[PDB]
Design a protein around this motif. Structure first.
Motif, PDB file in Angstrom:
ATOM      1  N   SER A  59       0.841  -1.199   0.000  1.00 28.23           N
ATOM      2  CA  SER A  59       0.000   0.000   0.000  1.00 28.23           C
ATOM      3  C   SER A  59       0.875   1.248   0.000  1.00 28.23           C
ATOM      4  O   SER A  59       2.077   1.169   0.216  1.00 28.23           O
ATOM      5  CB  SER A  59      -0.953   0.010   1.191  1.00 28.23           C
ATOM      6  N   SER A  60       0.270   2.408  -0.227  1.00 21.99           N
ATOM      7  CA  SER A  60       1.036   3.627  -0.392  1.00 21.99           C
ATOM      8  C   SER A  60       0.685   4.712   0.607  1.00 21.99           C
ATOM      9  O   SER A  60      -0.322   4.632   1.332  1.00 21.99           O
ATOM     10  CB  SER A  60       0.812   4.152  -1.809  1.00 21.99           C
ATOM     11  N   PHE A  61       1.536   5.732   0.649  1.00 15.05           N
ATOM     12  CA  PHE A  61       1.183   7.012   1.262  1.00 15.05           C
ATOM     13  C   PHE A  61       0.561   7.869   0.187  1.00 15.05           C
ATOM     14  O   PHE A  61       1.250   8.413  -0.668  1.00 15.05           O
ATOM     15  CB  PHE A  61       2.404   7.692   1.874  1.00 15.05           C
ATOM     16  N   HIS A  62      -0.758   7.958   0.215  1.00 14.09           N
ATOM     17  CA  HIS A  62      -1.513   8.515  -0.907  1.00 14.09           C
ATOM     18  C   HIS A  62      -1.812   9.984  -0.781  1.00 14.09           C
ATOM     19  O   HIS A  62      -2.268  10.602  -1.745  1.00 14.09           O
ATOM     20  CB  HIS A  62      -2.846   7.777  -1.079  1.00 14.09           C
ATOM     21  N   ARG A  63      -1.604  10.539   0.405  1.00 14.81           N
ATOM     22  CA  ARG A  63      -1.898  11.940   0.670  1.00 14.81           C
ATOM     23  C   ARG A  63      -0.833  12.447   1.617  1.00 14.81           C
ATOM     24  O   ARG A  63      -0.771  12.023   2.758  1.00 14.81           O
ATOM     25  CB  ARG A  63      -3.298  12.069   1.258  1.00 14.81           C
ATOM     26  N   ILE A  64       0.029  13.326   1.108  1.00 16.28           N
ATOM     27  CA  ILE A  64       1.195  13.811   1.843  1.00 16.28           C
ATOM     28  C   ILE A  64       1.163  15.309   1.745  1.00 16.28           C
ATOM     29  O   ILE A  64       1.351  15.827   0.678  1.00 16.28           O
ATOM     30  CB  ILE A  64       2.528  13.296   1.214  1.00 16.28           C
ATOM     31  N   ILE A  65       0.872  15.996   2.848  1.00 12.41           N
ATOM     32  CA  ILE A  65       0.850  17.470   2.871  1.00 12.41           C
ATOM     33  C   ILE A  65       1.993  18.003   3.744  1.00 12.41           C
ATOM     34  O   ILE A  65       1.989  17.761   4.946  1.00 12.41           O
ATOM     35  CB  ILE A  65      -0.493  18.004   3.415  1.00 12.41           C
ATOM     36  N   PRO A  66       2.967  18.733   3.148  1.00 13.95           N
ATOM     37  CA  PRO A  66       4.138  19.153   3.930  1.00 13.95           C
ATOM     38  C   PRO A  66       3.799  20.087   5.090  1.00 13.95           C
ATOM     39  O   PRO A  66       2.848  20.856   4.995  1.00 13.95           O
ATOM     40  CB  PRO A  66       5.053  19.862   2.889  1.00 13.95           C
ATOM     41  N   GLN A  67       4.587  20.008   6.166  1.00 14.96           N
ATOM     42  CA  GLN A  67       4.385  20.785   7.409  1.00 14.96           C
ATOM     43  C   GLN A  67       3.153  20.327   8.161  1.00 14.96           C
ATOM     44  O   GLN A  67       2.786  20.955   9.153  1.00 14.96           O
ATOM     45  CB  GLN A  67       4.252  22.315   7.178  1.00 14.96           C
ATOM     46  N   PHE A  68       2.506  19.262   7.691  1.00 14.40           N
ATOM     47  CA  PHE A  68       1.277  18.766   8.311  1.00 14.40           C
ATOM     48  C   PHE A  68       1.347  17.266   8.597  1.00 14.40           C
ATOM     49  O   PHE A  68       1.609  16.894   9.742  1.00 14.40           O
ATOM     50  CB  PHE A  68       0.067  19.161   7.448  1.00 14.40           C
ATOM     51  N   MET A  69       1.144  16.408   7.590  1.00  9.25           N
ATOM     52  CA  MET A  69       1.205  14.942   7.789  1.00  9.25           C
ATOM     53  C   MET A  69       1.345  14.129   6.502  1.00  9.25           C
ATOM     54  O   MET A  69       1.220  14.656   5.394  1.00  9.25           O
ATOM     55  CB  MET A  69      -0.021  14.458   8.560  1.00  9.25           C
ATOM     56  N   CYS A  70       1.646  12.841   6.685  1.00  7.83           N
ATOM     57  CA  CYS A  70       1.701  11.838   5.619  1.00  7.83           C
ATOM     58  C   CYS A  70       0.666  10.759   5.937  1.00  7.83           C
ATOM     59  O   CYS A  70       0.766  10.066   6.946  1.00  7.83           O
ATOM     60  CB  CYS A  70       3.090  11.196   5.564  1.00  7.83           C
ATOM     61  N   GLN A  71      -0.319  10.598   5.070  1.00  7.31           N
ATOM     62  CA  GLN A  71      -1.374   9.635   5.292  1.00  7.31           C
ATOM     63  C   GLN A  71      -1.253   8.436   4.374  1.00  7.31           C
ATOM     64  O   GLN A  71      -0.932   8.591   3.215  1.00  7.31           O
ATOM     65  CB  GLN A  71      -2.705  10.312   5.024  1.00  7.31           C
ATOM     66  N   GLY A  72      -1.545   7.252   4.900  1.00  5.36           N
ATOM     67  CA  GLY A  72      -1.477   6.008   4.113  1.00  5.36           C
ATOM     68  C   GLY A  72      -2.361   4.897   4.665  1.00  5.36           C
ATOM     69  O   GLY A  72      -3.175   5.128   5.573  1.00  5.36           O
ATOM     70  N   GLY A  73      -2.229   3.701   4.097  1.00  6.55           N
ATOM     71  CA  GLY A  73      -2.870   2.509   4.651  1.00  6.55           C
ATOM     72  C   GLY A  73      -4.010   1.889   3.880  1.00  6.55           C
ATOM     73  O   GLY A  73      -4.593   0.911   4.324  1.00  6.55           O
ATOM     74  N   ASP A  74      -4.331   2.430   2.714  1.00  2.80           N
ATOM     75  CA  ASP A  74      -5.403   1.853   1.894  1.00  2.80           C
ATOM     76  C   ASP A  74      -4.843   0.695   1.067  1.00  2.80           C
ATOM     77  O   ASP A  74      -4.298   0.892  -0.010  1.00  2.80           O
ATOM     78  CB  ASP A  74      -6.035   2.906   0.990  1.00  2.80           C
ATOM     79  N   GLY A 112     -15.095  10.763  10.664  1.00  7.08           N
ATOM     80  CA  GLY A 112     -16.011  11.063  11.749  1.00  7.08           C
ATOM     81  C   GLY A 112     -15.771  10.106  12.910  1.00  7.08           C
ATOM     82  O   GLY A 112     -14.941   9.202  12.829  1.00  7.08           O
ATOM     83  N   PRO A 113     -16.516  10.284  13.989  1.00  6.51           N
ATOM     84  CA  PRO A 113     -16.367   9.410  15.154  1.00  6.51           C
ATOM     85  C   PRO A 113     -16.565   7.931  14.833  1.00  6.51           C
ATOM     86  O   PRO A 113     -17.453   7.581  14.089  1.00  6.51           O
ATOM     87  CB  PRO A 113     -17.477   9.894  16.125  1.00  6.51           C
ATOM     88  N   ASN A 114     -15.731   7.074  15.401  1.00  8.44           N
ATOM     89  CA  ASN A 114     -15.951   5.639  15.368  1.00  8.44           C
ATOM     90  C   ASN A 114     -15.919   5.021  13.969  1.00  8.44           C
ATOM     91  O   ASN A 114     -16.655   4.055  13.686  1.00  8.44           O
ATOM     92  CB  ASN A 114     -17.265   5.294  16.091  1.00  8.44           C
ATOM     93  N   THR A 115     -15.026   5.563  13.121  1.00  7.49           N
ATOM     94  CA  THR A 115     -14.882   5.130  11.731  1.00  7.49           C
ATOM     95  C   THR A 115     -13.448   4.737  11.394  1.00  7.49           C
ATOM     96  O   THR A 115     -13.077   4.740  10.235  1.00  7.49           O
ATOM     97  CB  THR A 115     -15.363   6.231  10.723  1.00  7.49           C
ATOM     98  N   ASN A 116     -12.650   4.349  12.384  1.00 11.76           N
ATOM     99  CA  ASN A 116     -11.284   3.889  12.133  1.00 11.76           C
ATOM    100  C   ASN A 116     -11.271   2.595  11.312  1.00 11.76           C
ATOM    101  O   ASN A 116     -12.125   1.754  11.509  1.00 11.76           O
ATOM    102  CB  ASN A 116     -10.551   3.657  13.456  1.00 11.76           C
ATOM    103  N   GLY A 117     -10.317   2.458  10.382  1.00  7.99           N
ATOM    104  CA  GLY A 117     -10.126   1.212   9.619  1.00  7.99           C
ATOM    105  C   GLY A 117      -8.670   0.786   9.674  1.00  7.99           C
ATOM    106  O   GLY A 117      -8.193   0.208  10.664  1.00  7.99           O
ATOM    107  N   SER A 118      -7.968   1.077   8.596  1.00 10.25           N
ATOM    108  CA  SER A 118      -6.558   0.849   8.495  1.00 10.25           C
ATOM    109  C   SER A 118      -5.775   2.126   8.240  1.00 10.25           C
ATOM    110  O   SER A 118      -4.572   2.179   8.466  1.00 10.25           O
ATOM    111  CB  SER A 118      -6.270  -0.132   7.362  1.00 10.25           C
ATOM    112  N   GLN A 119      -6.428   3.158   7.763  1.00  5.98           N
ATOM    113  CA  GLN A 119      -5.726   4.331   7.313  1.00  5.98           C
ATOM    114  C   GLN A 119      -5.250   5.177   8.478  1.00  5.98           C
ATOM    115  O   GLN A 119      -6.016   5.483   9.387  1.00  5.98           O
ATOM    116  CB  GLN A 119      -6.591   5.140   6.351  1.00  5.98           C
ATOM    117  N   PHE A 120      -3.987   5.578   8.399  1.00  2.87           N
ATOM    118  CA  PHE A 120      -3.305   6.200   9.490  1.00  2.87           C
ATOM    119  C   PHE A 120      -2.497   7.337   8.930  1.00  2.87           C
ATOM    120  O   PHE A 120      -2.277   7.426   7.716  1.00  2.87           O
ATOM    121  CB  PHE A 120      -2.335   5.181  10.118  1.00  2.87           C
TER     122      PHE A 120
END
Length: 173
Positions: A59-74, A112-120
């Protein structure tokens, strides 16, 4: 039955080998705070070992915004929309005890609340406006340097400049 104050339960160490462009960029090592959030930590750990038959590898880091965060896990839809936990498609917010106090923290992406999956996501800043909304559950212990190289592929909008991929991942011993 008896009044106590329990010892911190043992914290697993996990890792992710990262590939930018298609060039090994190195290994990020992470400590998972099972002592505070064992349900969230166990999910991520399984998704690193692939022991349930699925997980982060490839899987990849599909959304990476500098000075903020790197999101992945899909790893299910491979387009930023998917993912699943070891408990099911989504699971509850365990608690919000840990805060987004600075760079190099692991927190769960959600819709939203209570919607965690794999993406971090891995923080690149104190993102304290996310406290109380995203469950923080770990930190980077090695390879802050590798995370900076992921961050350097970001855009203001989030589209990555090169493919950033979790080539391999796992648990230490």
């Amino acid at each position: 039955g008896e009044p106590i104050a329990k010892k911190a339960r043992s914290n697993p160490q996990v890792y992710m080998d990262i590939k930018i462009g298609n060039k090994p960029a190195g290994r990020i090592q992470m400590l998972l705070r099972s002592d505070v959030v064992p349900m969230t930590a166990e999910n991520f750990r399984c998704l690193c070992t692939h022991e349930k038959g699925f997980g982060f590898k490839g899987s990849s880091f599909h959304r990476i915004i500098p000075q903020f965060m790197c999101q992945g896990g899909d790893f299910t839809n491979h387009n930023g929309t998917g993912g699943k936990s070891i408990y099911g498609k989504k699971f509850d917010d365990e608690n919000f005890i840990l805060k987004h106090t600075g760079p190099g923290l692991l927190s769960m992406a959600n819709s939203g609340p209570n919607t965690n999956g794999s993406q971090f996501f891995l923080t690149c800043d104190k993102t304290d406006w996310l406290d109380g909304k995203h469950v923080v559950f770990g930190e980077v212990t090695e390879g802050l340097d590798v995370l900076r190289q992921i961050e350097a592929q970001g855009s203001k909008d989030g589209k990555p400049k090169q493919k950033v991929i979790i080539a391999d991942c796992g648990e230490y011993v």
